[PDB]
């Protein structure tokens, strides 16, 4: 069902999680990113807020921020041989979350179906759920279904990436939610029980 009141409730929660950048930027698109984050189960959002995880929206490069200067010139895991570095990567998630405004869609310098959901899933995985993507249960599921969203040499190799991408499929919209259920039924059930 359409749940605009739930989206509003999660947006209110996100008002204490999202950090907007200093420069000038597409304010409507930044708002759209927060709206897409509001699709995440509010339980997870409040757990992130409890741990003081900030979702930083950026108007420049990731490596333009002081706290990510250590990534200048660094080649992401699995991107070796491409000539690309973290300077060009629009999203990072884990112990922090940082997201370049405008780069949400797949192919905008990254492979995720949605940037902000993929990166925020990393933080939920790592901060809230103590690296559940490395848990024995998820490793068994990943062994069977980890290639079934495609990108078999990336998602199919790194369980934390398969977790983050599956989470993004689960929460982006009903189409991606349905595609996940069909391609990765055990992963879908796992995320269902996790939110239950």
> Is 44 annotated in some ligand binding site?
no
Whether residue 119 lies in the annotated active site: yes
Buried b / exposed e across 61-91, counting CB within 10 Å, b at 16+?
Answer: bbbebeebeebeeeebeebeeeeeebeebbb
- 145 is annotated as contributing to ligand binding: no
Q: Which residue is associated with the tokens 């998820």?
A: 138
Which CB, 13 or 71, lies closer to Zn ion?
Answer: 71
Q: What is the nearest approach in angstroms of Zn ion to the Cβ of residue 90?
A: 11
Question: Is 188 annotated as ligand-binding?
Answer: no
Residue 1, CA atoms < 13 Å, CB-side half-sphere: 4
Report how far apart the first and last C-alpha atoms of the chain are (Å, whole number).
18
In this complex, which beta carbon is closest to Zn ion, that of residue 145 or of residue 161? Answer: 161
At closest approach, how far in Å is the CB of 118 from Zn ion? 6
Among 40, 44, 43, 5, CA closest to 177: 40
Q: Which of residues 156-175 bind Zn ion (CB under 5 A)?
A: 161
User: Which of 116, 119, 145, 165 does the annotation list as catalytic?
Assistant: 119
Site stretch for Zn ion (CB under 5 A), options 8-16, 42-50, 155-163, 187-195: 155-163
Residue range at the interface with Zn ion (CB under 5 A); choices 43-51, 82-90, 96-104, 153-161: 153-161
Sites for Zn ion among residues 33-72 (CB under 5 A): none
Report whether 80 belongs to an annotated binding site.
no
Angle (CA) 157 158 161, round 5°: 130
For Zn ion (CB under 5 A), the number of binding residues is 1
Structure tokens at 169: 């499929």
Extract the tokens encoding 40: 């995440």
Report the alpha-carbon distance of residue 123 to residue 29 in Å, rounded: 22
Residue 121 CB, shortest distance to Zn ion, in Å, is 8
Residues that bind Zn ion (CB under 5 A): 161
List the binding residues for Zn(2+).
Answer: 118, 122, 154, 161
Q: Which residues are catalytic?
A: 119
């Amino acid at each position: 069902h359409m749940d605009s009141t739930t989206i509003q409730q999660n947006k209110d929660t996100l008002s204490q999680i999202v950090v907007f950048p200093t420069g000038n930027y597409d304010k409507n698109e930044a708002n759209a990113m927060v709206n897409r984050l509001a699709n995440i189960d509010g339980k997870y959002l409040n757990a992130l807020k409890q741990n003081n995880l900030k979702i930083k929206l950026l108007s420049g490069k990731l490596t333009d921020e002081k706290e990510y200067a250590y990534l200048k010139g660094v080649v992401p895991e699995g991107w070796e041989g491409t000539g690309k570095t973290w300077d060009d990567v629009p999203g990072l998630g884990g112990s922090t979350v940082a997201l370049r405004i405008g780069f949400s869609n797949k192919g905008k310098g990254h492979d995720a179906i949605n940037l902000e959901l993929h990166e925020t899933a990393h933080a939920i995985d790592h901060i809230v759920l103590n690296d559940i993507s490395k848990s024995a249960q998820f490793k068994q599921i990943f062994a069977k279904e980890g290639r079934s969203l495609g990108n078999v040499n990336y998602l199919g190799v790194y369980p934390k990436e398969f977790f983050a991408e599956s989470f993004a499929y689960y929460y982006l919209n009903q189409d991606t939610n349905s595609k996940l259920k069909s391609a990765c039924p055990q992963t879908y059930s796992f995320l269902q029980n996790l939110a239950k």
